[PDB]
Structure 1
Amino acid sequence: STSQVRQNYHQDSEAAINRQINLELYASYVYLSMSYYFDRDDVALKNFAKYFLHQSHEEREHAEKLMKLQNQRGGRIFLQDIKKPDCDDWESGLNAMECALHLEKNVNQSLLELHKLATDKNDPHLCDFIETHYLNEQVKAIKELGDHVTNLRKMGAPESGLAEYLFDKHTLGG
């Protein structure tokens, strides 16, 4: 039976929102894994660890907002397994930042495909939701990660452990 609230909400959009919820939860899990890598005693970069833990908690918030959207529009949430991150060892601060850049660009591509679907189904509320809450967040995240990668490369990372140490203090510390 049709939800009493549902209006102009295509079944393909509903399914795509469920896919996006899984992707945001996956991103949360990737950042959680990265964070505790930097907490290892043989890595020991505490501001890298705090930066990625914050990004993990952000992504959980991104997922919860999409779950709230699904219910606002009268769709039904269907959850899937959250796959483990492809990587147990992230190697260095520079490599983790490059992996985060690549993650945040795949999430953006998924959101752009979701916006194209919403446009094709003439769902301006969903278009505005994506634009307002997700697309500029992603552009800002990608720009920040690019900036971080550039600085770590210019400073001599990953071979310079002094580069990663000083970036941890001065950019992330900090």
Structure 2
Amino acid sequence: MMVISEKVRKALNDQLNREIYSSYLYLSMATYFDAEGFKGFAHWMKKQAQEELTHAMKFYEYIYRRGGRVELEAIEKPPSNWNGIKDAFEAALKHEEFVTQSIYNILELASEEKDHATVSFLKWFVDEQVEEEDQVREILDLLEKANGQMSVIFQLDRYLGQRE
């Protein structure tokens, strides 16, 4: 017997599919950076795509621990081009803030149903979103200071390209 409501399971299943798309979106930003010849930025996006997949698998395993199951949905085509390095990272920031709000909505839904197990499970993602948003804001701050100077952009490519 499923011990989460179907309304909470659907919210969790929806967020899992959102994490899959986020991973797909970051891979598509990698295709853009690789097309532009920035292999450090592309490498950063490829690792970010891997991290989003581990987010989805965390939702995956919790759903089965509460007696639910996962249904994978179609993944819509992400954008493949941006008007520059900062335009892509600004799109990344806007996306992460959207993901954070989507997590907030599940937390409030589970809270009103007094599903404390799901409320507590989501705490890790609330904290992780703070990290993810901040990491993009820091990059955007460095790009603003670079102001297109390729000497500085080359260093940030090699630096972000060292992400493990």
Q: TM-score range by the shorter chain?
A: over 0.9
Written as runs of structure 1 = structure 2, the 5 A alignment for 1:36-75 is: 36-40=31-35, 43-75=36-68
Q: Structure 1: which amino acid aligns with 2:73?
A: Q
Larger-gyration structure (1/2): 1
3-state secondary structure, aligned to 1:39: helix
**How many residue pairs get matched?**
162
Q: Percent identity?
A: 33
Displacement of 1:15 after TM fit? 0.8
Question: Residue in 1 aligned with 2:153?
Answer: 164
Deviations 1:130-153 (A, max 9, x none): 102x11111011011011101101
Q: Which runs of 5+ in 2 are unaligned?
A: none
Q: Which amino acid aligns with 1:17?
A: L
Determine if contact 1:93/1:164 at 8 Å carries over to the other structure: no
Higher normalized contact order (CA 8 Å, seq sep 6+, divided by chain length) = 2
TM-score w.r.t. the length of structure 1 is 0.87
Unaligned runs of 5+ in 1: none
Q: Which residue of 2 aligns with 1:119?
A: 111
Residues 144-163 of structure 1 correspond to what in structure 2 (within 5 A)?
144-157=135-148, 160-163=149-152
One-letter code aligned to 2:160: L
The structure in which a higher percent of residues are helix is 2
